[PDB]
């Protein structure tokens, strides 16, 4: 008899993508290979991200991709995003970029290409740079989802600012006993 807890012996990370789609799965076959045979950890990070959920690979807006490449020095590079590239209607002038993405929305595609931008697929990125050399690996804001505003220290727990799940906002949906001082108390 041995004393170990077998409690957290199984690591819960993903191995493959849970999706069954065939084009992504080909990318996975390609980046598994590169991951293992190259020294590049870029390939490993990319590989890891191909297995993740929709939630877990959030969309990267065009404006966010602009400003991250506006940063000093990462000039004449390629931005990479395992998610999708979306438009920003609240940005106007779009520099000529180099981009990798699993998806780019039709607007975002036009705007970039009109600028003299190049768009790449991930099979194309590999041939272009199999060890991820000269890349900017970005990500969309993970904690964008409105979901997260309900997460945390519960509402009605002093110093929480945590959206309650409520049928409809309005004068008479919550905001009585436990928010006003006038009505019982407040947190």
């Amino acid at each position: 008899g041995v004393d170990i807890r077998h409690n957290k012996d199984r690591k819960v990370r993903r191995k493959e993508p849970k999706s069954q789609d065939i084009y992504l799965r080909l990318l996975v076959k390609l980046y598994r290979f590169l991951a293992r045979r190259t020294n590049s950890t870029f390939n490993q990070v990319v590989l890891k991200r191909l297995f993740m959920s929709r939630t877990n690979r959030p969309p990267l807006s065009l404006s966010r991709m602009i400003r991250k490449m506006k940063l000093p020095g990462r000039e004449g590079k390629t931005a990479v995003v395992v998610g999708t590239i979306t438009d920003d209607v609240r940005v106007q002038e779009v520099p000529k970029l180099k981009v990798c993405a699993l998806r780019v929305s039709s607007r975002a595609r036009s705007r970039i290409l009109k600028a003299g931008g190049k768009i790449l697929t991930f099979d194309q990125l590999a041939l272009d740079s199999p060890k991820g050399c000269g890349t900017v690996l970005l990500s969309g804001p993970r904690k964008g989802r409105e979901v997260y505003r309900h997460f945390g220290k519960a509402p009605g727990t002093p110093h929480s600012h945590t959206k309650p799940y409520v049928r409809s906002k309005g004068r008479k949906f919550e905001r009585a006993r436990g928010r006003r001082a006038s009505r019982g108390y407040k947190n």
Partner: protein, 136 residues
């Protein structure tokens, strides 16, 4: 591609046959009857297939062109080899090795031809061997 359409097909094709813990595949120009990527007639730009001759004597090799698949009518190109066993193999060998065509296959293609030339063994001889038929 080859790989893309293998993704579509791997588990669903009419030619496949699971059952009894094995799997197999019945698509034509698959030597080794495997549901493999390697050994699949329909998928690959260049294909080998070693069937027996309809005569009952000999073997047919079945190359695929590259010229134009899209046009299956014209795509495969058959060729009977009805020669002295040892020769038959060598002709297949050269077809495969010295044309640099499907080099991966080739030894499987030889064994198939070999087994086919075994088939055309003698049925009567086998019957004699199994039963002694002596003194009732």
């Amino acid at each position: 591609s080859a790989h893309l359409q293998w993704m579509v097909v791997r588990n669903c094709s009419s030619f496949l046959i699971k059952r009894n813990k094995q799997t197999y595949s019945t698509e034509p120009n698959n030597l080794k009857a495997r549901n493999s990527f390697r050994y699949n007639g329909l998928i690959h730009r260049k294909t080998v297939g070693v069937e027996p001759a309809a005569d009952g004597k000999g073997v047919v090799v079945v190359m695929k062109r590259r010229s134009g698949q899209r046009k299956p009518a014209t795509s495969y190109v058959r060729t009977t080899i009805n020669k002295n066993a040892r020769a038959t193999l060598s002709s297949i060998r050269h077809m495969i090795r010295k044309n640099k065509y499907h080099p991966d296959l080739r030894m499987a293609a030889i064994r198939r031809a070999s087994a086919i030339l075994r088939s055309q063994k003698p049925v009567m001889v086998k019957r004699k061997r199994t039963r002694p038929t002596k003194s009732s």
